[model samples]
Target chain A: MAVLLSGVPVLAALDVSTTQKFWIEVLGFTEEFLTEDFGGVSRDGVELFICSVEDQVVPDNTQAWLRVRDIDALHAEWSARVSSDYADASHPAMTAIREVPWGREFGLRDPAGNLVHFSELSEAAE
Target chain B: SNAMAVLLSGVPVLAALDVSTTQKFWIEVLGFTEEFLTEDFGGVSRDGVELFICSVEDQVVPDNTQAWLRVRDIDALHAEWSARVSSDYADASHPAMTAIREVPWGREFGLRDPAGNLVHFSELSE
Candidate 1:
């Protein structure tokens, strides 16, 4: 398949309700498009997703990214999200979102303490 | 005030409607939660997972492909994606049908979406 720049995926291995909600609700994404009805549920799309379990053994090779407008502000908003996990577990990195020297920006984390990297696009303040 | 930095994610959860039509699809298709279903564009975090779907809309990116995620034990998923795609992979006349074979990751098969994404199905080895 021809890989069109969805950019590179930045997976967020989630493990909680709050982490799931943060991206869908606070960030404003939708359920990846589903068609008709498939087994009492609708399965479709990439980008944002709430992981479900039935029989899918997702590969550790998975990762996703969210290109935000302002990494700092988005980072702040992420920081501003539900704080219970942040305070108690130090789950998401204290400095999860950062600017890359490669001239791109990103937010990084796998909220459930899973091994994955999330990126938030940042703009260098030149 | 024209500083949105980067593109915040538009869609989140990616569901393959009839998951069974692939060599293998993700264990959890649709990647759902009640809150994500009821609320689109609302501000909140249901939890760790961010759900959204991929489709023709949200036309920022120039793609019309359906990137399918497939897994083994696809019989249950065949039940899921039975509408648009054929669930009977054993027949060899199906789109997302793969001869049920054991794989390192999953029991995989694949289906051709009405669009373009070649969805696969593979179940994990127990």
Candidate 2:
């Protein structure tokens, strides 16, 4: 009745090369494998697959909530990295980490507008 | 080392076309618990594996979405899904189970959700 989920995939409408860079540089995911049409990344035993397809309306067709531990620490690190490496006046995906009912998390957009929300469990639950 | 980076938890949110249908398939047929549901989103869990279902219009980017699952017994999982297919849980005509096959990574089998996404359950060869 119970199953163990290992990897979660995000649909990448952009080229894998570009998506791969953003994930590694901005998100700190290590490159696991890359091919002509597919690529994968891994961090702390969690694996993510980036499926590159040109026709998928890349702008806003993807969404995911990535659960993590110690979100605040991760948030601070990403903030500094994004400010220094990716400088832009008005970035839609770039926002402050805030509290939600389920967890405290922040939203991020891949190069193709895929919504990836990284969350940590509520303190009480933890 | 780098900000403790991120230690990803098991839960992963998935984009869905119909929240109601997705909920039924995952819960009744796949043996998942309906954890939470909102107007536009819902969450389900089985063991440590949590998956959230979100509805998005014109969502084609996630057509080939997949979740690679690790299970102690692949054949048992396959048989369980197969039995459900013949019962009231799913359409008997649709075969949800596949022959255990060998892949580059290891030996695995697949089960298709009502939405046509594949949930691959694998037992990594030791």
Candidate 3:
């Protein structure tokens, strides 16, 4: 039998605790693990690894795409929660849902600057 | 269905100096099938796992970007990837692949693309 394969993105985090808090309290992902230098967060079956970095300056352009079911609802929940709890400029920012060529999507930029795009495919395409 | 319930799947979006070159590398060398390609962005998949590649304009491509791949029969997979990379990227500047090493969690190896983004293949220990 052919080997089975799966993948997850490993994002750089300046501080694992703060990053984990953002993903859990703010983004609603479950904690997978936590260490001083490494941690993981997941929603449904999708997982992302957070690795601590010493560099004060890390790349902000790195991104991830998340295919989601019921993205509009997810966005509404997240948006309300973020606005209510984390209204400060330093907190992670969210973009309103917009139509893209492939689907409807929204973006979230973590404190570490890693971008995550949440998308739901069009009905015709799905 | 519950309004708050959603299923999420993630695809890492890696930065590339040239999107076409990176897309081709993923297809030819990394054994991923091309899903879609545009001028500045592309998607590739293998065994249901997907990744997106995007062209970087003003920023230097960072080497720290990473993805974690989970595989069964990793030794065999590593050997096959090693042979393929050795033949295809013999003259490449960056180190393409690393020898499999045993870590606390599992046996793993790292594969670096021409643009410096990394994919870590690992088989976890029971």
Candidate 4:
């Protein structure tokens, strides 16, 4: 049987608006679904939801990987919009663009410390 | 011009967790009906929604990892979940389930698993 994986949600113990700023304004995902407690955003064909909780710790390895056609462009866009009302100390360094066994990729941390990795496939892998 | 085409290949991996217990939570309480297991990894799915439960030590970070699922009937699911949760988690500090509540966009309910993963379902009000 074929499986369907719809979307991923990043949990935030902090303000939803903070995560919202990172996802919507910085990452350029559009808000297609949301509520005060839950917010959903989609870019290209990728979808992410941010759910708010109280007194929760964003765990050490909480992260997501996304595939895009252009790693350089996305990383550049991310760099240009790195500093904003939502970007804070919690956000970590962007992994320098480098080629790995998997592909050419880089990573960024969200306000809650979840690493969102973006990559473009290498020619041989594709 | 930085527009790009991105396609979500799926969540490559949600979290590394205690395989048996996490599998029980995903299969018994979360409605992921299909199950596949190996010593290192396992998976469960319902409809098109799927998640992996893995036993990798470094990946098992508590209070991390979450997903947002779109449900057709939030009330029915809430009812189903509330009824089954206690039975599903007898000896543990059970996860929290909220009574269906109003949010900024619609009515939604949520769950927090023993591992501290946050998952919520939302039915958008049209």
For each candidate, report what fraction of the true interface contacts it reproduces: 0.15, 0.50, 0.65, 0.40
Q: Give the TM-score of candidate 4.
A: 0.60
Candidate 3 lDDT by residue in tens digits, A1-126: 336376787777778788888899888899999999889999888888987766634436678878888888988888776542224546677888899977899888788767778899887755
lDDT per residue for candidate 2 within A85-119, as digits (tens), equals 22342342455788887678777777766667787
Per-prediction DockQ: 0.09, 0.48, 0.60, 0.27
CAPRI rating of model 1: incorrect
Better of 1 and 3 by DockQ: 3
For residues A42-98, could you state the per-residue lDDT of candidate 1 as single tens digits? 112234333322221231222333434455655555566534243444544434544
Docking class of 2: acceptable
DockQ of predicted candidate 2: 0.48
Per model, state how many residue pairs clash: 96, 0, 0, 3
Highest-scoring model, DockQ: 3
* lDDT per residue as tens, model 4, B1-126: 646546544443455456677777778776677557776666676785656554545533544457766667777777777776643323447777766778876877667676555566777688
In candidate 1, position B118 carries an lDDT of 39
After superposition, which runs of candidate 3 have C-alpha atoms over 4 Å from their true positions?
A1-4, A54-59, A84-89, A123-126, B57-61, B87-92
Write down the TM-score for model 1: 0.35
| Ranking of all candidate structures by their TM-score, best first | 3, 2, 4, 1
Q: Against the unseen true structure, what C-alpha lDDT does each candidate score?
A: 0.36, 0.68, 0.77, 0.63
Where model 1 places Cα greater than 4 Å from the true spot, the runs are A1-19, A26-46, A54-62, A82-96, A104-126, B1-126
lDDT of 1 by residue, B45-109 (tens): 11232323322223212111223243334666555555545655444433444444555555655
Ranking by lDDT: 3, 2, 4, 1
Ignoring the other chain, what TM-score does chain B have in each prediction? 0.36, 0.78, 0.85, 0.73
